[PDB]
Amino acid sequence: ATWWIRQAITRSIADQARTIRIPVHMIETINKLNRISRQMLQEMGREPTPEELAERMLMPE
Amino acid sequence: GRTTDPVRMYMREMGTVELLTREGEIDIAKRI
Amino acid sequence: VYSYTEKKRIRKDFGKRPQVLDVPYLLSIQLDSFQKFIEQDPEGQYGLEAAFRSVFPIQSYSGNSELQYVSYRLGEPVFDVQECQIRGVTYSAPLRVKLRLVIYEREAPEGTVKDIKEQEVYMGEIPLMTDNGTFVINGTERVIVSQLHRSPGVFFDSDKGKTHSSGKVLYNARIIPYRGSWLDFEFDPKDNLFVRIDRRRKLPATIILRALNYTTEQILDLF
Amino acid sequence: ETLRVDPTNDRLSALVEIYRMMRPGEPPTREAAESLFENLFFSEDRYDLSAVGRMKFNRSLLREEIEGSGILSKDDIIDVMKKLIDIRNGKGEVDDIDHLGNRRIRSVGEMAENQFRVGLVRVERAVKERLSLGDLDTLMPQDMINAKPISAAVKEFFGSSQLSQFMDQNNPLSEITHKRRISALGPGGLTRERAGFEVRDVHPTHYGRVCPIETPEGPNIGLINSLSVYAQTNEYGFLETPYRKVTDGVVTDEIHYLSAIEEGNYVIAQANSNLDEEGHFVEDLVTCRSKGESSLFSRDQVDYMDVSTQQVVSVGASLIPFLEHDDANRALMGANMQRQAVPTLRADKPLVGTGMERAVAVDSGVTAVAKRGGVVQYVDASRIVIKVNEDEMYPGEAGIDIYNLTKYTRSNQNTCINQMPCVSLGEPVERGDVLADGPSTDLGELALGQNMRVAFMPWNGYNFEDSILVSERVVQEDRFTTIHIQELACVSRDTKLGPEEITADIPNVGEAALSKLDESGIVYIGAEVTGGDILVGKVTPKGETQLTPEEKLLRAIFGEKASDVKDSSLRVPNGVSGTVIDVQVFTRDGVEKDKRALEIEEMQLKQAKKDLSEELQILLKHEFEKKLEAKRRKITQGDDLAPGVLKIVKVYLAVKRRIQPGDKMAGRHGNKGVISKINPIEDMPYDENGTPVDIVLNPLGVPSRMNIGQILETHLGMAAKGIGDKINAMLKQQQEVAKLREFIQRAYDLGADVRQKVDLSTFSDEEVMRLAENLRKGMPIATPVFDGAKEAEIKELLKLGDLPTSGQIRLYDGRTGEQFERPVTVGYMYMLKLNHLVDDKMHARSTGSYSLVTQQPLGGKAQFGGQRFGEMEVWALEAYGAAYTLQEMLTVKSDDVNGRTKMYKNIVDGNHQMEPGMPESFNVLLKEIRSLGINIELEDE
Numbered sequence A: 001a002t003w004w005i006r007q008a009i010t011r012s013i014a015d016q017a018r019t020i021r022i023p024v025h026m027i028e029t030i031n032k033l034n035r036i037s038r039q040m041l042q043e044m045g046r047e048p049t050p051e052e053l054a055e056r057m058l059m060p061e
Numbered sequence B: 001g002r003t004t005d006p007v008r009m010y011m012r013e014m015g016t017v018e019l020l021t022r023e024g025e026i027d028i029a030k031r032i
Numbered sequence C: 001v002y003s004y005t006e007k008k009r010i011r012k013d014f015g016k017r018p019q020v021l022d023v024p025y026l027l028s029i030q031l032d033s034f035q036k037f038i039e040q041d042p043e044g045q046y047g048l049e050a051a052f053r054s055v056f057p058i059q060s061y062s063g064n065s066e067l068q069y070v071s072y073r074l075g076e077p078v079f080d081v082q083e084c085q086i087r088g089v090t091y092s093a094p095l096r097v098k099l100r101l102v103i104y105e106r107e108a109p110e111g112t113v114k115d116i117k118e119q120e121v122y123m124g125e126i127p128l129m130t131d132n133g134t135f136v137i138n139g140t141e142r143v144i145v146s147q148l149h150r151s152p153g154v155f156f157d158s159d160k161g162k163t164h165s166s167g168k169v170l171y172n173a174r175i176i177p178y179r180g181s182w183l184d185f186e187f188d189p190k191d192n193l194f195v196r197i198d199r200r201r202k203l204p205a206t207i208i209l210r211a212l213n214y215t216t217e218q219i220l221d222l223f
Numbered sequence D: 001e002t003l004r005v006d007p008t009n010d011r012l013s014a015l016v017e018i019y020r021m022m023r024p025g026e027p028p029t030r031e032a033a034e035s036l037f038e039n040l041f042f043s044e045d046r047y048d049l050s051a052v053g054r055m056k057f058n059r060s061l062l063r064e065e066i067e068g069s070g071i072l073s074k075d076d077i078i079d080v081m082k083k084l085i086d087i088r089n090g091k092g093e094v095d096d097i098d099h100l101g102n103r104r105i106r107s108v109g110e111m112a113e114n115q116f117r118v119g120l121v122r123v124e125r126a127v128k129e130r131l132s133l134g135d136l137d138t139l140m141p142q143d144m145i146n147a148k149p150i151s152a153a154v155k156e157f158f159g160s161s162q163l164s165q166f167m168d169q170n171n172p173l174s175e176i177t178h179k180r181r182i183s184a185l186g187p188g189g190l191t192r193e194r195a196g197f198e199v200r201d202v203h204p205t206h207y208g209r210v211c212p213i214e215t216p217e218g219p220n221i222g223l224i225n226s227l228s229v230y231a232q233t234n235e236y237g238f239l240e241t242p243y244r245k246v247t248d249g250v251v252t253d254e255i256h257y258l259s260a261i262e263e264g265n266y267v268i269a270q271a272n273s274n275l276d277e278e279g280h281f282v283e284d285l286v287t288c289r290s291k292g293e294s295s296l297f298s299r300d301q302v303d304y305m306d307v308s309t310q311q312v313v314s315v316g317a318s319l320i321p322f323l324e325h326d327d328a329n330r331a332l333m334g335a336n337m338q339r340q341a342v343p344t345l346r347a348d349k350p351l352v353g354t355g356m357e358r359a360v361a362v363d364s365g366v367t368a369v370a371k372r373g374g375v376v377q378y379v380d381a382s383r384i385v386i387k388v389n390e391d392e393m394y395p396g397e398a399g400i401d402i403y404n405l406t407k408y409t410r411s412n413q414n415t416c417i418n419q420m421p422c423v424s425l426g427e428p429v430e431r432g433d434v435l436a437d438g439p440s441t442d443l444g445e446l447a448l449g450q451n452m453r454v455a456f457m458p459w460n461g462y463n464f465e466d467s468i469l470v471s472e473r474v475v476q477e478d479r480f481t482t483i484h485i486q487e488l489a490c491v492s493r494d495t496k497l498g499p500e501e502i503t504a505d506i507p508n509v510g511e512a513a514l515s516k517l518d519e520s521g522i523v524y525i526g527a528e529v530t531g532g533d534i535l536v537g538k539v540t541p542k543g544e545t546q547l548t549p550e551e552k553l554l555r556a557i558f559g560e561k562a563s564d565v566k567d568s569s570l571r572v573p574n575g576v577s578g579t580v581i582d583v584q585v586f587t588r589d590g591v592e593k594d595k596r597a598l599e600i601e602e603m604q605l606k607q608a609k610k611d612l613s614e615e616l617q618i619l620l621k622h623e624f625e626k627k628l629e630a631k632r633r634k635i636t637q638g639d640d641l642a643p644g645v646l647k648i649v650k651v652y653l654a655v656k657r658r659i660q661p662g663d664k665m666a667g668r669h670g671n672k673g674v675i676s677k678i679n680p681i682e683d684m685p686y687d688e689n690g691t692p693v694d695i696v697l698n699p700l701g702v703p704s705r706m707n708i709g710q711i712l713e714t715h716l717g718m719a720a721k722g723i724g725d726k727i728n729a730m731l732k733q734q735q736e737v738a739k740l741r742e743f744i745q746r747a748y749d750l751g752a753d754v755r756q757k758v759d760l761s762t763f764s765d766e767e768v769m770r771l772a773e774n775l776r777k778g779m780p781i782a783t784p785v786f787d788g789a790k791e792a793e794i795k796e797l798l799k800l801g802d803l804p805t806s807g808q809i810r811l812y813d814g815r816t817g818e819q820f821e822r823p824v825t826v827g828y829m830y831m832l833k834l835n836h837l838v839d840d841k842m843h844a845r846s847t848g849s850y851s852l853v854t855q856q857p858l859g860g861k862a863q864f865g866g867q868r869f870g871e872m873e874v875w876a877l878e879a880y881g882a883a884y885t886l887q888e889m890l891t892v893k894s895d896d897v898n899g900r901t902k903m904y905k906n907i908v909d910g911n912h913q914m915e916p917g918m919p920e921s922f923n924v925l926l927k928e929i930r931s932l933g934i935n936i937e938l939e940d941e
Helices: A002-016 A024-044 A050-056 B006-014 B024-031 C028-038 C047-055 C081-087 C206-211 C216-222 D011-022 D030-041 D051-060 D074-089 D108-131 D147-159 D172-179 D260-265 D328-338 D357-363 D472-476 D552-558 D595-618 D621-636 D709-732 D737-749 D765-775 D791-800 D871-879 D883-892 D897-908 D920-931
Strands: C065-074 C092-104 C113-127 C141-144 C146-150 C153-156 C172-176 C183-187 C193-197 C202-204 D103-106 D164-166 D239-246 D251-259 D285-289 D294-298 D304-306 D374-380 D383-388 D400-404 D434-437 D450-456 D468-471 D486-495 D534-536 D539-541 D565-567 D579-587 D645-654 D675-679 D695-697 D824-833
Touching (some): A002 A024, A024 A050, A024 C113, A024 D147, C047 C065, C153 D074, C193 D074, C202 D011, D011 D030, D108 D147, D172 D357, D251 D304, D486 D534, D579 D595, D709 D737, D709 D765
Parallel strands (some): D468 D675
Antiparallel strands (some): C141 D164, C172 C183, D486 D645, D579 D645
8 A cells, every 4th residue: 555655656756746737747857856966965966957957867967 | 621623623533542552454354 | 562563552541440450352252162062072061072971871761772872073164264154054063973882782781792883973063163153154254242131040030019909919939940841839829839831720739749759748858 | 818719739740630631632642741841951862051051140149169060950049049049038139130240242253153053953963863773784974964054054144044134245344343242132042122111221340341322323223332432241151341359448450351250259449549659549538339329438448440442432432532522323423323434445543543543443354564674675556575584573574564554445335445555665663563554544543534624603594403614625635535345247148049258249239339349248447437337248139039020020121130139238337437447257166268268367377377486486385386386377277157157247447426515414423414504615614824624514513412512622623623734834934854853742741731752852863753744734642532631631721723712713614705703613523434335325216127016116326216205204295285296106107007108208299198097016016915715795786
């Protein structure tokens, strides 16, 4: 039941938590970017630049 | 006393039922 | 004796009372406070050391895995004050904290530890304070004004008879802590002692005593 | 009786009762109630009296232990109850909440520490949650701690909080008085809406700790008090002020800082108490203050004496000469105003000061004070180099100190910050000496304004209520002229239709408009621009214009093409006319730098190399090359801009506002005034020597508001300028060193026993010449706040010069040359130009942008909006018979969407008539009530 409850809660957050709704795939991308930026913040010291995330992540920049 | 907080009312209405006993869920699934 | 910049143009001075204490450094109030906050002392009295010692020793509830604080340091600011003003940035210094994650062996109440992982971790940037008691936050020079607030403690502030007819004075007490909820004791015109918790209904005063594991006999013994 | 009324009988019953009170509706239970109660006061995590809290708690209960625990205890609560009962019946005094012994001081460090602790606890929650599942080698103490919460807390406190405000930077005095400001507002204090009068009122404990007169008049009066001159802060946070210990009868020189609660225990003498050169009071009975009140006491009864006569006022109020002669209201106004004086083109000096100017100027970091004594090796308008004396030289160093003066840069109030060297080549300077004068400073003396020859007389109603008449000579000399550097930013974002460009090719504008811009579309440096000229040429893509008919026809007729880019170039604001003194270009990393950006970048690099190279030449090489590469990287690294913005261009305009009617001028004694007329020189009143008066002030403004300080200052300034004129005359003819020395020495003695001693015998002939050259403009005079110059001394100084002792001369009307009867009072008064320039306040609007939800004009002068015709103005119109005026005011001029376009058209063809219609705001109200379950409609449609 935990799997399903977490799924429902997080999908609801993704679907009706913003005035300008954004899709689930884009919310996943944003969350991944946030998690990786947070990790690089401590692994680097000040901040990751958008180009710097093109390496940790695999997106065209 | 009395309250207007909906979450408090939900916690009151739901906390009445005992949580569960092991092999209780299996029996309930059997009934289903 | 006259300093050269004063020998150029001496201001004729009336006034007869000799100066015994010269005017102190006028910005001491801000510089001393921020110096205490930022500089680390080998005690928990002031600043980031005080905060870390107050909160940082971590215990994992029912896990007995601990994370503890060793020390901290302030990294060199990335940008200078003028550079921050030009580009527009907070003149801040990275805060590097030396942490140690200690893992306790299961069933080791004596304190036997499995391993210790001592690592230094970045915890945000705290804005620094220019030489003249100013902070630049987004390229704009900001000043934090000192606040004058009621001191923590106990105060007895009986009203002036403005509540009930006949101008009867109603006496009350109030415990104001730095952190936590308020504890107020007040009287009613019927001459009874009541406790009030902050933003809460009135209750008879003896309720708190009973909550403190006190019986009626010993309550009357005290009072 | 409380037990009688107590419904509870047992501990558990009381626990559940307090649980019901705290959390109604939640069914109480044993464990929950017990945990809540224990956590309320007796758990260190959620309750703590700071060391100051414990100290005050124990003191209030007369305990003898100054330390303790931060959490309550049964003994503490029962003792509080016992003392409450005692004060109810026995001997007990209600604690005075406004007592400064009961009010603490929170500074920046403490608040920052509290906010950092809040961040620490709210990341501690997360770290514990993650530790809920312990792991061995899959985790490090770098993944369990997140910097975002702590950074957010600290940034929220420092940037956006009530207790962190933009620095008032239009003055050294304003800066310093803002830094040492005590506020009762903010998170954890009162609110201006419901503060109450009792807290706002001044208290007998404010003596020597908080200024009684420096406070903003308005919604928050008595809540923004300012720290006194000598006031300090205890370890706990209670304001303490110095006092000089008094033995049996001798006023010792040792200083003790006494807190508010400690003051009452002793009786303290006044600063204005005479001493017979040996510490003994001349008068057996002296005036003191024991507990709030003051009275007379025997000589052998006092324990302390005021350190100085200045310690009751703040820094701002201590700069007002003859303050003791001014009514408290006018002194308050004068302080609040002189906080706002704008730095002028040439800061002259206060001809009549209080001796505090040096301290204010030096303490505020506006001047460059030599860190070490030595000989000035090289002076330049932009830098100073000091050859440190060998005595102060450290062994392993080169004794060279370089001070880099701050040239013309913008302040927070768009004023000019500019430092000028005040020393010459090869001059000796000792540690603590002022090298460069900052804005509104003269040789280390605070100089907020100018000293002007004023005369007190009506002069034809041109100074009627508070207006001021100014001579053209004031304008000609440009002595109230100010510089007003300001920023203008043009940002090119990335729009959906395409990126914006900063090309110089702008449609619908001729060659002349684009003459000032270079090939890259950005204005040159030094160009003299005017309101409407283009600074940065920017164009935004556009399309699908959907051209109307009878315009497509025009385009076809004249064969022109509709441009796909609309002009959005940054133009100088209307009215503003200045010179572009600096241009900065910030380019996003990925974007390609334009020609101008590269040209600026190269100039910065060469400047950086020159500065570093000059550093090494004057004076190590390893750090030079290491620093150069670091600086080179920073210059070309690429800027971190907001998302979407491609490139930011900032242009700095340097305006020069001279003077004009409507500009507010004010003295130091609360005497406001708005310039009304600028007179030709020949029209001003003049004396027997033909010297006109620079300003004419109404005398009727003095008696009503009891500020005689301005009159006394005028007399003293006249005397000072008399001495200065004598010195100037004796210099114009090369009299001698001896004559100048004798006269100057006589000037510094001046009768009454003044603590200052000046012996010109120790001054070299060259030094005396410099001194006299610096006095030919007038002899500066210091008049301490409450120990100022007595009127007899003013008369004596007037007599030193050949001026009349009455302080009044006979003037002649320049218009007619006929002597004014009743000789008038002329003298030199220190006038300031407050930052309320009429240029910044004039505003007019015919039509413009309209608000979004309510189709109404916008705010004031920033959105080019119209004035608010408030409810009271509507009442005023109703009281008149003006129905049509009112209707057009609230229907056509403001809100009727169809109405105002028709009114504009009708006016255009000279047909002054209106079709009122229905205001749009009423339609919004109807749709909003109908958005409830209410059916509101218009009958008989």
